[PDB]
Amino acid sequence: GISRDNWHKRRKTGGKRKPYHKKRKYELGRPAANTKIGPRRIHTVRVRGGNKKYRALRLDVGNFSWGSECCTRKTRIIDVVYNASNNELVRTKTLVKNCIVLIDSTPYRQWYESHYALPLGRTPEEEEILNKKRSKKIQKKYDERKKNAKISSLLEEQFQQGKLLACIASRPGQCGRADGYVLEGKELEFYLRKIKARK
Amino acid sequence: PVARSWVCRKTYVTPRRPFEKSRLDQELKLIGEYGLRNKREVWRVKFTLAKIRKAARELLTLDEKDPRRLFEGNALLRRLVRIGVLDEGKMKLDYILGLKIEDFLERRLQTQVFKLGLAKSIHHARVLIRQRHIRVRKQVVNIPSFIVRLDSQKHIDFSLRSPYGGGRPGRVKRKNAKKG
Amino acid sequence: ARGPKKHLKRVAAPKHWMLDKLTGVFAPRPSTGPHKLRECLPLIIFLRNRLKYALTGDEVKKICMQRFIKIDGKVRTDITYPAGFMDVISIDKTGENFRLIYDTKGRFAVHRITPEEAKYKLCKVRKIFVGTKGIPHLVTHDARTIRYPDPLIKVNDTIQIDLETGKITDFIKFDTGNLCMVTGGANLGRIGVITNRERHPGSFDVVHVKDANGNSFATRLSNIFVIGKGNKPWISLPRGKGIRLTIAEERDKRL
RNA sequence: CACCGCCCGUCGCUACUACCGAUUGGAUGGUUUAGUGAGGCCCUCGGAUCGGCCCCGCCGGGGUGCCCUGGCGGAGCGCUGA
RNA sequence: CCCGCCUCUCGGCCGAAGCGUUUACUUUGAAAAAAUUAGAGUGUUCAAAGCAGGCCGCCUGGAUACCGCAGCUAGGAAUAAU
RNA sequence: CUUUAAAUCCUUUAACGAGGAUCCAUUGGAGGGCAAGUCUGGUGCCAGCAGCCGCGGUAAUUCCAGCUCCAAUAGCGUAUAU
RNA sequence: UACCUGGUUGAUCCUGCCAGUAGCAUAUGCUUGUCUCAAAGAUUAAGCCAUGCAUGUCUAAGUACGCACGGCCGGUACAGUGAAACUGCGAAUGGCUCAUUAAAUCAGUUAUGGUUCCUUUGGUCGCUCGUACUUGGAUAACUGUGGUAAUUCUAGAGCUAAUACAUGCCGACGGGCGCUGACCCCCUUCGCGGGGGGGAUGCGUGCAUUUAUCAGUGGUGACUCUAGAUAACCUCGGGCCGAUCGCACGCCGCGGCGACGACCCAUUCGAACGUCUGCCCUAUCAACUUUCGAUGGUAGUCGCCGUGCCUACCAUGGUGACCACGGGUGACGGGGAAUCAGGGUUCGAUUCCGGAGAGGGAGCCUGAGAAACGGCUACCACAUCCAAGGAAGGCAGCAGGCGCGCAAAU
């Protein structure tokens, strides 16, 4: 089939190599999973060893992590903006490892409103988790944890638009999942520079 | 894949110069003395003495307290004193090389039946052995090249089923003792 | 070969099984088991060639399916089950017990043990790790996995287990000054007291032993099996007691 | 064979060998530029056919089809799966 | 033939231990598939072979050596390069 | 009998089985190399032998035959790789 | 036993080759009484093949309503022996040959800290806080109707099982730990104030899987190991959390001995990919390799995992008289064989190991394991039967015949 053997290619000196066996099954390679954005469709491939390899072909949800405050919740996946390997993996919305995606970021703003008291990204029933009757003892805890509660500008300016930039850290062609992290810190400045220059 | 053994060797070496008159003279003298049948029976004894002398000629270039010398020289001289061609006092490795080829021809069963008085000539001794008359301590031996080591050299007798031994004389006399 | 092998020819068998050449083409392949293929005795060899309780190969099967033979106190119906290096082979119809011990030529001996002695064995501990909410495990050289060991036990130690239960009674730590037996290479079977270990990063470690005669050898660290504490052996030994005599003194003893 | 010695070349005689061979003559296997390209496998569709739900005649009967299983009926891209 | 007068961190009168320009050479030691080849034992009736067999249930063999080169190791430091 | 799945062969043993012991050993050789004819008949540079040197043209030490012998011996002769 | 002999001349001493001499294997000629061992279609044609045969399997312990036999001294689920078919496993080892293959194979060596592993043997299997006194639908054997000239072809009708295919709770089960904390109570309740102590209600929980942080249960030469804590993910093509079966029989509800089972971990047979060093002849092959992969970098896809294995972008490298690259080989490699004073030289298809292939090439299904050919799908090539509509092929398995041959068995 598609083979990933070592013996169909020339030596380090550059001479040809005549083959001494045919293609075996431990040298197989299979055609790719161009995982697009859509409703969830996963086939499983029975592999050498008897185990399963989960072949994702469409995904709209992944488990993404805001690592600075250790809050990992499951979000939608909206749009891809960048890929460091190929521009045709941007215009065809193909999800591979280490692409740059757009996520929905509503449970992150929901957790930021729930753990701390301060708002993010701006209805009295949601004021009933923002502004409600408390004792003085629990508000001593809430007024303690507002000191390190100022979040940096480069994420907060996109919480106004409701889409966090995030990068896939799992391999969606072997395990069928799209888990990853959100871009922060220096890496957010780098990748905003590269999307700013790639158009 | 078979359950076999193919291990064999040849036990004589044909001479290089085939028609040298001195070689023909000495080996024909050994044939006529010791009652051998053909020259291959001489060359086989030359091959076994040559293998013995090659073993001693290999051991003699060693330091004399290397333990291969001290073990295998004692084993080789013990086998040569056991078959009788090297006498009991002179068990030193330099006395292997003084073996003549007539030592192993004296210890054959044919020559030890002629020298122990059990035959009237040496050719009578070989034709006595080959007709199942001679036994060595209750084993009836049909081999004229049986080399008698000296804990079997003592027991050489006629058979218990032979006419010159115990009884039941042969078909010639019992057809002859029917006259009427 | 497109898979595993299932046969083993007679001339490619181990030398220490002492097989013939002309009885047949094949040798019994040991089953997959606790012990390695070059380092074991199957039961069909041990009952047919060493003890001569059964002459042909069908009678070893007629012995073993009557639930007669215990290997380590467990009834074993496979005739090619591997056993070796203090498997306690116990036959209860005749009341005998055997422990597989290398004699000093390197071969598995018929060496008989006491009926009080056959409730224990020794095991070299090869791997120590933790697991699954901090449960410490211990892996012996015959692949017994024991949970909850003594926390002083480290790699290359010898423990003594109860053959009914499977639990550790006591252990020996690896040192100089312990008596030792080799399960090994060219010095297989020699018994002596340990004098040294030279420690190398990245390679096999060499352990120097001194015998009861005082002649010394050294082997790799994966070949060293501690028998006892001090110079006190914890098992019944073969009759030569592991002293290798040379070919000169072995001929003089046969004289 | 000892100068009445020996031997060299061209040409014509014989049989045997290899050569450049007029021939764009055939037997053949490799590596190939370009065009078509069976078939397996992967994806995107496909949806013959079969099953389940749901609608009601089948049952005054433990409540006077009022949960009751009994026999169901036949259209419903119905509502959904293989 | 062998050692001695003429390195340092420190562990129960220092076994243990911080390390010193490299390598070639040599000598020991480990690991080196059996079968074959030298080879020990043993009267297949001798032998080529074989791994058996022996004594009136008992005793005992199924050794050993070499396996070049490259790799590994601790002792030597003439001869040779740096 | 014994062997052996069941036969065979070997071993054990009972009856027959040797004068010319017709129960009849062959293959290459006799100039040198190379152990062995300076024999008797034929052919007369023809037939042929000859690995090489050579023998053959009417006393052939070599061909074709007989006798004798002489290597090897249940074997030896020839052809090719080595 | 480290060896020589005839041949250039009228004669001699030499360089020198021819011929002799001895092994050894392949054939062939003439010959033949015994007995123990014993190679045997490799050489040319890895050319073609008629026929039989070479892989199947049932225990006390998966499923029997076949009277196929048969007990019940006869009245109830089934005695028992059991052909068949379903199911499970094996068919991937063994065998045969040497055609390709000259840093490839292979050998010693070292590594997986870069991966998988059916089976055996030990560990684990009330750790999970959320109809069960046992659930559903079928299809075979069997009965019955047939097609086709033709096959180990199978189509319709009627039955009935499961350790086949499914769907699924109960118990442990009192709780525990993190989260959220309306509330109660004791502080120095002084005037803002103020340190603890229980805690209502609600949320998530174990192992496997995927990620993202914080810390330093044991070991390693060396981890980004193993373990533990936190916030979460967990695939409809779906991860474990037992709906199975036999024997012994009971104790006042609770049970013993087993065969079978699986998420996982271990090690057992291995396999796969790698390190260092070693291969016969040729210069009438001295320069080769390429941006469509030649050497390297980064990010991926893919794989069982490491990597140009492959795709994208970028760098211009890599090997070479210490013989690359190209060609030859009657070249499988090695353990080994015949000769041999020491050195060498030559041979090794061949019974052990390792590789490769089943006419030439491909591509796949199942499976733990295959690029399987005593499996399938085509193409090429050659061949058999035919009702010319179609059907089936593979001896380099044992014997056997064709053919090629000097040259090989029932």
UniProtKB/Swiss-Prot annotation, chain A:
Transferase listed as a keyword: no
Give the sites modified to Phosphothreonine.
T123
Question: Where are the N6-acetyllysine residues found in this chain?
Answer: K36
Q: How does this protein sit in the membrane?
A: Lipid-anchor
**Database matches in PROSITE patterns:** RIBOSOMAL_S8E
Q: Which keywords annotate this record?
A: Acetylation, Cytoplasm, Isopeptide bond, Lipoprotein, Membrane, Myristate, Nucleus, Phosphoprotein, Ribonucleoprotein, Ribosomal protein, Ubl conjugation
Task: List modified residues, type Phosphoserine.
Answer: S153
Q: Where is this cross-link: Glycyl lysine isopeptide (Lys-Gly) (interchain with G-Cter in SUMO2)?
A: K163, K186
Annotated spans, Disordered: 1-26
Where it sits in the cell: the answer is: Cytoplasm; Membrane; Nucleus, Nucleolus
Q: According to its record, what are the GO cellular component terms?
A: cytoplasm; cytosol; cytosolic ribosome; cytosolic small ribosomal subunit; endoplasmic reticulum; extracellular exosome; focal adhesion; membrane
What are the GO MF terms of this UniProt record? Answer: RNA binding; structural constituent of ribosome
- The answer to whether keyword Lipoprotein applies is yes
> What family is this protein classified in?
Belongs to the eukaryotic ribosomal protein eS8 family.
Q: How does it assemble?
A: Component of the small ribosomal subunit. Identified in a IGF2BP1-dependent mRNP granule complex containing untranslated mRNAs. Part of the small subunit (SSU) processome, composed of more than 70 proteins and the RNA chaperone small nucleolar RNA (snoRNA) U3.
Role according to the record: Component of the small ribosomal subunit. The ribosome is a large ribonucleoprotein complex responsible for the synthesis of proteins in the cell. Part of the small subunit (SSU) processome, first precursor of the small eukaryotic ribosomal subunit. During the assembly of the SSU processome in the nucleolus, many ribosome biogenesis factors, an RNA chaperone and ribosomal proteins associate with the nascent pre-rRNA and work in concert to generate RNA folding, modifications, rearrangements and cleavage as well as targeted degradation of pre-ribosomal RNA by the RNA exosome.
Family annotation (PANTHER family):
40S RIBOSOMAL PROTEIN S8
Q: In its UniProt entry, what is this protein called?
A: Small ribosomal subunit protein eS8
Recorded source organism is Homo sapiens (Human)
Gene name tied to this protein: RPS8
From Swiss-Prot, chain B:
Q: Does the keyword Disulfide bond apply?
A: no
Q: Name the SMART domains on file.
A: Ribosomal_S4, S4
Any one Pfam family here would be Ribosomal_S4
Residues crossing the lipid bilayer are: none
Entry keyword Ribosomal protein:
yes
User: Recorded GO terms, molecular function?
Assistant: RNA binding; rRNA binding; structural constituent of ribosome; translation regulator activity
Q: Which Gene3D superfamilies match?
A: RNA-binding S4 domain
CDD domains tied to this protein: S4
Q: Which residues carry this modification: Phosphoserine?
A: S152, S162
| InterPro entries, alphabetized | Ribosomal_uS4, Ribosomal_uS4_CS, Ribosomal_uS4_euk/arc, Ribosomal_uS4_N, S4_RNA-bd, S4_RNA-bd_sf
Location within or outside the cell: Cytoplasm; Nucleus, Nucleolus
- What range(s) does the S4 RNA-binding domain occupy? 107-180
Record cross-link Glycyl lysine isopeptide (Lys-Gly) (interchain with G-Cter in SUMO2), residues: K92, K138
Looking at the record's lineage, which domain of life comes first? Eukaryota
Name the keywords, alphabetized. Answer: Acetylation, Cytoplasm, Isopeptide bond, Nucleus, Phosphoprotein, Ribonucleoprotein, Ribosomal protein, RNA-binding, rRNA-binding, Ubl conjugation
Sites of the modification N6-acetyllysine? K65, K115, K154
Region Disordered, residue ranges: 161-180
Instruction: Choose any GO biological process term that the UniProt entry carries and state it.
Output: ribosomal small subunit biogenesis
NCBIfam families, per the entry: PRK04051.1, uS4_arch
Role of this protein: Component of the small ribosomal subunit. The ribosome is a large ribonucleoprotein complex responsible for the synthesis of proteins in the cell. Part of the small subunit (SSU) processome, first precursor of the small eukaryotic ribosomal subunit. During the assembly of the SSU processome in the nucleolus, many ribosome biogenesis factors, an RNA chaperone and ribosomal proteins associate with the nascent pre-rRNA and work in concert to generate RNA folding, modifications, rearrangements and cleavage as well as targeted degradation of pre-ribosomal RNA by the RNA exosome.
For this chain, the family text in UniProt reads: Belongs to the universal ribosomal protein uS4 family.
The protein's matches in PANTHER family, at most eight in alphabetical order, are given as:
30S 40S RIBOSOMAL PROTEIN, SMALL RIBOSOMAL SUBUNIT PROTEIN US4
**How is the subunit organization of this protein annotated in UniProt?**
Component of the small ribosomal subunit. Identified in a IGF2BP1-dependent mRNP granule complex containing untranslated mRNAs. Part of the small subunit (SSU) processome, composed of more than 70 proteins and the RNA chaperone small nucleolar RNA (snoRNA) U3.
What name does UniProt use for this protein?
Small ribosomal subunit protein uS4
**Organism from which the protein derives:** Homo sapiens
Q: Which gene encodes it?
A: RPS9
Curated annotation (Swiss-Prot), chain C:
One GO biological process term: cytoplasmic translation
Q: Which residues cross the membrane?
A: none
Q: Does the record's keyword annotation contain Calcium?
A: no
Q: Which UniProt keywords apply?
A: Acetylation, Cytoplasm, Isopeptide bond, Nucleus, Ribonucleoprotein, Ribosomal protein, RNA-binding, rRNA-binding, Ubl conjugation
Please report any disulfide bonds recorded for this protein chain, giving both cysteine positions. Answer: none
Keyword Transmembrane helix present in the record's keywords: the answer is no
> Which positions fall inside the S4 RNA-binding domain?
41-103
Q: Which residues carry this modification: N6-acetyllysine?
A: K232
Entry's family note: Belongs to the eukaryotic ribosomal protein eS4 family.
- Give the function comment from the record: Component of the small ribosomal subunit. The ribosome is a large ribonucleoprotein complex responsible for the synthesis of proteins in the cell. Part of the small subunit (SSU) processome, first precursor of the small eukaryotic ribosomal subunit. During the assembly of the SSU processome in the nucleolus, many ribosome biogenesis factors, an RNA chaperone and ribosomal proteins associate with the nascent pre-rRNA and work in concert to generate RNA folding, modifications, rearrangements and cleavage as well as targeted degradation of pre-ribosomal RNA by the RNA exosome.
Tell me how this protein assembles.
Answer: Component of the small ribosomal subunit. Part of the small subunit (SSU) processome, composed of more than 70 proteins and the RNA chaperone small nucleolar RNA (snoRNA) U3. Identified in a IGF2BP1-dependent mRNP granule complex containing untranslated mRNAs.
Q: What is this protein called?
A: Small ribosomal subunit protein eS4, X isoform
- From which organism does this entry originate? Homo sapiens (Human)
